[PDB]
Specification:
The chain contains four helices and three strands; from the N terminus they run ααβββαα. It has 129 residues and is mainly α. The protein has one domain: Lysozyme. It has a three-stranded antiparallel β-sheet with strand order 1-2-3. The PDB classes it as hydrolase.
């Protein structure tokens, strides 16, 4: 499913991402915008044969099992397909582990290149408080 901006902000807020590890909600919404265009079904293959899954494009090389990334790790202990559900719970819980892993949100290349150091609060203006 394709989330609307404010709908996703609300779902993410409800799942505890607002200021998770010091990253305000705008950061997560911006990251989702540029990783997946708010589409829970987004997949993208990487050059190394791993694949990114879901609304935050979580990579099978470390974080989930898709059965076709030899050497993969599955740190979130989930099948990668659970990251494609219209329920973002699995994506959010795995994202919490990722952002705690020491590199913070720099683990998302699109956040680093397109959200970091911008006015991310603009991504939540108009949502209900």
């Amino acid at each position: 499913k394709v989330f609307g901006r404010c709908e996703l902000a609300a779902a993410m807020k409800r799942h505890g991402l607002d200021n998770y590890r010091g990253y305000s909600l705008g950061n997560w919404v911006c990251a989702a915008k540029f990783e997946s265009n708010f589409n829970t079904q987004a997949t993208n293959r990487n050059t190394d044969g791993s694949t990114d899954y879901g609304i935050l494009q979580i990579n099978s090389r470390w974080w989930c099992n898709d059965g076709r990334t030899p050497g993969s790790r599955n740190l979130c202990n989930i099948p990668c397909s659970a990251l494609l559900s219209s329920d973002i719970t699995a994506s959010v819980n795995c994202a919490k582990k990722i952002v705690s892993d020491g590199n913070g949100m720099n683990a998302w290349v699109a956040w680093r290149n397109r959200c970091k150091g911008t006015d991310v609060q603009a991504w939540i203006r108009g949502c209900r408080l």
